[PDB]
Design an enzyme around this catalytic site. Structure first.
Site, short mmCIF file in Angstrom:
data_model
loop_
_atom_site.label_atom_id
_atom_site.label_comp_id
_atom_site.label_asym_id
_atom_site.label_seq_id
_atom_site.Cartn_x
_atom_site.Cartn_y
_atom_site.Cartn_z
N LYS A 187 22.90 -17.44 -29.07
CA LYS A 187 23.95 -17.36 -28.06
C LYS A 187 25.17 -18.19 -28.42
O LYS A 187 26.04 -18.39 -27.57
CB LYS A 187 23.41 -17.80 -26.70
CG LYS A 187 22.55 -16.77 -26.03
CD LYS A 187 21.92 -17.31 -24.77
CE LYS A 187 21.16 -16.23 -24.05
NZ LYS A 187 20.33 -15.43 -24.99
C1 LIG Z 1 27.54 -25.26 -14.21
C2 LIG Z 1 26.52 -25.05 -15.31
C3 LIG Z 1 27.14 -25.30 -16.69
C4 LIG Z 1 25.23 -24.69 -15.09
C5 LIG Z 1 24.43 -24.34 -13.76
C6 LIG Z 1 22.89 -23.93 -13.67
C7 LIG Z 1 22.08 -22.87 -14.55
C8 LIG Z 1 20.79 -23.24 -15.27
C9 LIG Z 1 22.40 -21.59 -14.73
C10 LIG Z 1 21.60 -20.57 -15.58
C11 LIG Z 1 21.82 -19.23 -14.84
C12 LIG Z 1 21.20 -17.90 -15.32
C13 LIG Z 1 20.14 -17.14 -14.61
C14 LIG Z 1 21.63 -17.28 -16.36
C15 LIG Z 1 20.99 -15.96 -16.81
C16 LIG Z 1 21.71 -15.49 -18.10
C17 LIG Z 1 20.90 -15.24 -19.35
C18 LIG Z 1 21.37 -16.11 -20.41
C19 LIG Z 1 19.92 -14.37 -19.53
C20 LIG Z 1 19.03 -14.06 -20.78
C21 LIG Z 1 17.48 -14.36 -21.02
O1 LIG Z 1 17.04 -13.01 -20.78
C22 LIG Z 1 16.21 -14.05 -20.30
C23 LIG Z 1 16.53 -14.11 -18.79
C24 LIG Z 1 14.94 -14.90 -20.42
O2 LIG Z 1 13.96 -14.89 -19.72
C25 LIG Z 1 14.92 -15.89 -21.57
C26 LIG Z 1 13.74 -16.50 -21.91
C27 LIG Z 1 13.74 -17.37 -22.93
C28 LIG Z 1 14.88 -17.65 -23.61
C29 LIG Z 1 16.07 -17.08 -23.32
C30 LIG Z 1 16.08 -16.18 -22.25
C31 LIG Z 1 17.40 -15.49 -21.94
O3 LIG Z 1 18.30 -15.85 -22.54
#
Ligand code: A1AT1
Ligand code: POV
Ligand SMILES: *[C@@H]1O[C@H](CO)[C@@H](O[C@@H]2O[C@H](CO)[C@@H](O)[C@H](O)[C@H]2NC(C)=O)[C@H](O)[C@H]1NC(C)=O
Ligand code: CLR
Ligand code: NAG
Ligand code: NAG
Lengths: 664, 35
Positions: A187
């Site tokens: 990412k």
């Molecule tokens: C102000 C700041 C600065 C932070 C606040 C709090 C915070 C914490 C927010 C996180 C919010 C969420 C919800 C983002 C979802 C976006 C996303 C990046 C999805 C991809 C994902 O598809 C997956 C959801 C997943 O399960 C996963 C598992 C293991 C590793 C990586 C992943 C993934 O990257």
């Protein structure tokens, strides 16, 4: 020591190989390993009818079906449907015994072998959880996870409440660290940092507290993109240490409670939730059994101190089983750090994004949108250039992104066709993809015969067009042109390479279409009028409706243009629909499309104000029909193996019975 | 028949299923009954 209470070990433990096997076969409590063994084996029981496709094998692996399949190895051909239900029965009895801990070594191999059979049988079903469930079934086959809370404890006295080595946790902690941290390195792309990948995600209702403090454009950049980059980079770092685990367990349980409701990823948000207490102390399920009431503790497993086991090295030189465990720790966790960056070796699987999707932990980092797919065969006996359907014999749409799957599709179409009076087709794919809101361009070269094209797994594909990364600063202007249009006008942005052309057929529906040249030099040919027209930068040209036109790119640079089109028959429908929409309230195919839309709008309205106790009562009957059809259609073919196949009128009597909705 | 397309529908640039295959309902009733 300051380090020894921080990293769990001293630096002198890594000073030899005998001292490293002694460290990695340390007697560790079996209880945290056995709760994850239950929770993984129970989430695999619920995953086999839902996502593995036991409810829908009769639609997927049906006998007599002309189908282009995409296995990783080309020699992997599936079994008959009578026997593919037995593969999913053995995989069910593997996950059932791995859940209970009953014959756990056999039940792991009875799950591990038909999982990676059906996983490698279709490259289009690969994603980062289907890869992970086969990794966790590969690890747990060698782990002594039935040393607590199992049926092997009730049958064998040396498997009841016995110590496990430390490498059973250090591989499982090393795995979930690599799932988190390598995803935070993937990412670091310029599409995830600048906020282009998953840009529509902030408009979900779960991000509504963040919009009370930030704007909708700043919720997307900070919270979704940078708060998913700073969390993935620092999830396995926070869960590891003692000073930051209780803070780090909150941020990763919120991360997976959101991804359980945002995306349909199966059991991925529950497997990553059941594996986060592996970073806790291994006695945590003994600390919760002791906190229970006294009459509850007789149904729970043992709370006593664990008995000494053979698999551990006690303060004694280690044998063979201990040396093969510390070697499995260092060789597997180094292999898991290499495959997301092993894309320089498998360079035939390399496209616009590096490598094949599923094993790189690049989750949601690249999103696509296919404007136009055009398959042109060519009859070898007559020369009759014809046009195939876009998705003919496939059961997915992932072949249009990957060069290996396009060669499998072009090869499979070379043999299937002769049943449709095309003896030896020459097949050209003209596939227009735009990745992360870029210009639509051809990913594969549309002039080469993909049947006889040279794809090799370790050499770079010569017929994959380069992703025009020099037109990536244009995307800030593309949101300006898309915002400048009203509710009726739609735009399509297209970049074409030098020497190529785009033969497009404007429908009769699309009156008032125009092409404007953003960069370069294109010469738009009207086919019927047989007249060319050279465009300059910014110049607009009106295109005829219901006719052909070709856009020849003649610039030495890859030219950018856009299709500013409006559906006039959609207008003439909706301005005449709005005419009798007001005429009805003052008091013949047009009345049929009218009345089906009003009952559609009352259906979308009724779906929004249904109570929450009915959405969950319909969710279970939707799910319990999946578990009923996957069980009853299994015994339909398990009768076909033991008792043989019945008559076809009797086979109708069971399949219509198995397809019954239970309480609907 | 259903596996091909014309050059008016295949040249248009702007323009859980698993069972809308070509020979599906004939091969379904073969390796099942008249369901
Ligand atoms: C102000 C700041 C600065 C932070 C606040 C709090 C915070 C914490 C927010 C996180 C919010 C969420 C919800 C983002 C979802 C976006 C996303 C990046 C999805 C991809 C994902 O598809 C997956 C959801 C997943 O399960 C996963 C598992 C293991 C590793 C990586 C992943 C993934 O990257
Ligand atoms: C100022 C100095 C700071 C240094 C920071 C350096 C960066 C650190 C980044 C943290 C990274 C987090 C990775 C998670 C992996 C967990 C491994 C593990 O559990 O260790 C266990 C054993 O440790 C060993 O057995 C060492 C042998 C290495 C095997 C793994 C090598 C992987 C790379 C292969 C190629 C090589 C100890 O676990 P524990 O004792 O039972 O409990 C944890 C103790 N604690 C709660 C106190 C934490
Ligand atoms: C309009 O211009 C284009 C390009 O200037 C012409 O396309 C060429 O057609 C010839 C013969 O069909 C090909 O050999 C060339 O390779 C084409 N050019 C390119 C860049 O591919 C087209 O024929 C012209 N049409 C008319 C009616 O003059
Ligand atoms: C073909 C039928 C009989 C099933 C045979 C099982 C074989 C093909 C399966 C079972 C266990 C699998 C392995 C499990 C774990 C990993 C680690 C991963 O990072 C790369 C793939 C790799 C190395 C798999 C390769 C394929 C594998 C060996
Ligand atoms: C075609 O659509 C554009 C879109 O803004 C508009 O400006 C133009 O007037 C339209 N032409 C006709 C003839 O309707
Ligand atoms: C235009 O709108 C009509 C609505 O009746 C629709 O059937 C048609 O497919 C649309 N044309 C295009 C090119 O989308």
């Amino acid at each position: 020591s300051r380090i020894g209470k921080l990293l769990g070990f001293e630096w002198t433990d890594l000073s030899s190989w005998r001292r490293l096997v002694t460290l990695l076969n340390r007697p560790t409590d079996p209880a945290s390993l056995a709760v994850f063994r239950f929770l993984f084996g129970f989430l695999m029981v619920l995953d086999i009818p839902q996502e593995r496709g036991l409810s829908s094998l009769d639609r997927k692996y049906l006998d007599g079906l002309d189908v282009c399949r995409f296995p990783l190895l080309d020699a992997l051909r599936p079994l008959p449907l009578d026997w593919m239900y037995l593969v999913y029965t053995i995989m069910f009895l593997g996950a059932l015994g791995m859940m209970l801990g009953l014959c756990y070594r056999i039940s792991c191999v009875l799950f591990l072998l038909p999982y990676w059979y059906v996983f490698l049988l279709d490259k289009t079903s690969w994603n980062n959880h289907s890869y992970l469930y086969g990794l966790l079934a590969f690890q747990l086959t060698f782990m002594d996870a039935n040393h607590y809370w199992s049926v092997d404890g009730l049958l064998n006295a040396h498997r009841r409440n016995a110590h496990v080595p430390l490498w059973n946790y250090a591989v499982l902690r090393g795995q979930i660290f690599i799932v988190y941290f390598i995803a935070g390195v993937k990412k670091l792309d310029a599409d995830w940092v600048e906020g282009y990948s998953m840009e529509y995600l902030s408009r979900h209702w779960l991000f509504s507290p963040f919009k009370l403090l930030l704007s909708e454009e700043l919720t997307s950049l900070l919270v979704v993109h940078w708060g998913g980059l700073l969390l993935d980079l620092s999830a396995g770092f926070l869960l590891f240490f003692d000073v930051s685990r209780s803070i780090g367990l909150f941020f990763v349980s919120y991360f997976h409670c959101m991804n359980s409701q945002l995306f349909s990823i199966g059991m991925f948000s529950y497997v990553m939730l059941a594996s986060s207490p592996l970073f806790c102390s291994p006695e945590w399920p003994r600390k919760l059994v002791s906190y229970c009431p006294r009459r509850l503790q007789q149904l729970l497993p043992l709370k006593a101190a664990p008995q000494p086991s053979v698999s551990c090295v006690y303060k004694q030189k280690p044998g063979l089983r201990h040396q093969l465990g510390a070697a499995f720790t260092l060789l597997y966790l180094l292999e898991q750090l290499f495959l997301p960056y092993s894309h320089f070796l498998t360079q035939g699987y390399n496209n616009w994004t590096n490598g094949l999707y599923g094993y790189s932990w690049d989750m949601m980092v690249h999103s696509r949108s296919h404007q136009h797919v055009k398959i042109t065969y060519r009859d070898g006996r007559t020369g009759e250039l014809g046009y195939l359907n876009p998705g003919v014999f496939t059961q997915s749409r992932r072949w249009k992104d990957h060069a290996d799957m396009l060669k499998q599709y072009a090869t499979c179409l070379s043999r299937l066709l002769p049943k449709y009076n095309v003896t030896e087709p020459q097949i050209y794919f003209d596939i227009w993809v735009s990745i992360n809101d870029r210009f639509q361009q051809r990913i594969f070269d549309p002039r080469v015969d993909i049947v006889q094209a040279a794809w090799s797994p370790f050499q770079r594909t010569s017929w994959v067009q380069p992703l025009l990364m020099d037109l990536s600063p244009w995307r800030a202007k593309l949101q300006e042109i898309k915002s400048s249009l009203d509710n009726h006008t739609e735009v399509v942005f297209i970049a074409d390479f030098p020497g190529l052309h785009l033969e497009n057929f404007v429908s009769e529906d699309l009156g008032n279409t125009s092409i404007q040249l953003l960069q370069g030099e294109v010469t738009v040919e009207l086919v019927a009028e047989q007249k060319n027209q050279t465009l300059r930068e910014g110049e607009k040209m009106q295109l005829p409706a219901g006719e052909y036109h070709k856009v020849y790119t003649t610039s030495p640079s890859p030219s950018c243009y856009m299709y500013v089109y409006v559906n006039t028959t959609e207008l003439a429908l909706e301005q005449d629909l709005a005419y009798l929409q007001e005429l009805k309230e003052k008091v013949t195919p047009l009345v049929q499309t009218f009345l089906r839309r009003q009952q559609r709008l009352q259906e979308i309205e009724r779906r929004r104000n249904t109570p929450f106790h009915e959405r969950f009562f319909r969710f279970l009957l939707r799910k319990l029909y999946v578990f009923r059809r996957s069980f009853l259609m299994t015994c339909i073919s398990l009768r076909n193996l033991i008792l043989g196949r019945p008559s076809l009128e009797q086979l109708a009597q069971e399949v219509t019975y198995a397809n019954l909705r239970p309480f609907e | 028949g259903a596996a091909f397309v014309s050059k008016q529908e295949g040249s248009e640039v702007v323009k859980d299923e698993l069972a809308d295959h070509i020979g599906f309902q004939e091969a379904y009733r073969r390796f099942y009954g008249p369901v």
